[PDB]
Structure 1
């Protein structure tokens, strides 16, 4: 009811004013399980790649954050092998005032500017802090293979 109408509202807002590089909507007619895709920023080792996200809205949304997993394989210090993303606003900083499109933005940005202080993958984090080139080189490789 409050959960069903809040998601319908957000879907409708997109169904009108469409984002540019982001693209999201429900899978099938399941209003609680969405799928989305985004392109890697131009100034990132993910540039040109296409990433698919899986989205699960909590039954008590928007008072509880949505579950966002990455479908595509990505080499990022804040994203692990299962697609989990360590992002502040998907947890401790979540708030009913935020939207999914707002969550998508913070993600386009996370890829542009990772956060080595939230080492969800310590190996990728260390390579990041000390040998940025090795990391940027490996990020682009994985983009060619998977982000297509």
Structure 2
């Protein structure tokens, strides 16, 4: 039903979870993963638990997984639909990358938000021009939406 790579990736995610990340396959769809990422220490998301869904497209692993935040989060690299601005620079996705690699990068993005186009992303404008207030807003949203939510 599934290529061995997906089976073995799933097995290793369950037996050897990424620190601060819970990722489990859907019981009715083995290509679908329910993810929780803990807010990193010393980030404005500290103490929060953020739900995400991850889907393995038909073309995986030649195509990257599709990931979205399901929990509201105030972050300059996440848009209003929960899509994430990551993407390996000056190269493309390759089967040398795996699900664990994507999840680690999202968690790293929560510690080190990168700049973004202020246009069509007001969160990026706030992070650039009023970082202390933008961090203050991210903390409030973390308390409101990302606590006691699991």
After TM superposition, is the score higher than 0.5? Answer: yes
The SS at the match of 2:40 is coil
CA shift in 2, pair 1:120/1:32, >3 Å = farther
* Structure 2: runs of 5 or more not aligned: none
CA shift in 2, pair 1:19/1:129, >3 Å = same
CA shift in 2, pair 1:137/1:57, >3 Å = same
On the 8 A contact 2:76/2:114 being kept in 1, the answer is yes
C-alpha distance in 2, partners of 1:113/1:105?
12
1:1-148 to structure 2, matched below 5 A, reads 4-89=3-88, 93-117=92-116, 121-148=120-147
RMSD in angstroms over aligned alpha carbons? 1.9
Q: What per-residue deviation string (whole Å, max 9, x for no partner) do you get for residues 14-54 of structure 1?
A: 23223221110112231111110010001100001000111
C-alpha distance in 1, partners of 2:42/2:10?
29
The answer to which structure has the higher helix fraction is 1
Q: What per-residue deviation string (whole Å, max 9, x for no partner) do you get for residues 55-84 of structure 1?
A: 110111100011101100000111011111
Deviation, 1:118, is 5.2
C-alpha distance in 1, partners of 2:69/2:118?
17
The SS at the match of 2:3 is helix
On the 8 A contact 1:78/1:119 being kept in 2, the answer is no
Deviation, 1:89, is 3.5
On the 8 A contact 1:80/1:121 being kept in 2, the answer is no
CA shift in 2, pair 1:4/1:121, >3 Å = farther
